[PDB]
Amino acid sequence: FFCPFGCALVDCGPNRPCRDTGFMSCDC
């Protein structure tokens, strides 16, 4: 799902970093 600026509301919250290679594509 489209991510904002990291792990925010993704799979932990805006704290842990994730693998973002494409616009709105953060894979944690």
CSV table of C-alpha atoms in Angstrom, one decimal:
chain,number,residue,atom,x,y,z
A,1,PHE,CA,0.0,0.0,0.0
A,2,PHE,CA,1.0,3.6,-0.6
A,3,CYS,CA,3.3,4.8,2.2
A,4,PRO,CA,3.6,8.4,3.5
A,5,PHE,CA,7.2,9.0,4.6
A,6,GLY,CA,8.3,5.7,6.2
A,7,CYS,CA,6.8,3.1,8.5
A,8,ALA,CA,4.1,5.6,9.5
A,9,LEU,CA,0.7,3.9,9.6
A,10,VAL,CA,2.4,1.1,7.6
A,11,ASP,CA,3.5,-1.8,9.8
A,12,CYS,CA,4.8,-0.2,13.0
A,13,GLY,CA,4.4,3.6,12.8
A,14,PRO,CA,6.6,6.7,12.0
A,15,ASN,CA,9.6,5.3,13.9
A,16,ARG,CA,11.3,2.4,12.1
A,17,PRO,CA,12.7,2.8,8.6
A,18,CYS,CA,11.6,0.7,5.5
A,19,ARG,CA,12.7,-0.1,2.0
A,20,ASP,CA,11.2,2.6,-0.2
A,21,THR,CA,12.3,2.3,-3.9
A,22,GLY,CA,9.2,3.7,-5.6
A,23,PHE,CA,6.8,6.6,-4.9
A,24,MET,CA,4.5,5.4,-2.1
A,25,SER,CA,6.0,1.9,-2.0
A,26,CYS,CA,7.6,1.4,1.4
A,27,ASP,CA,8.3,-2.3,2.2
A,28,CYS,CA,9.0,-3.0,5.8
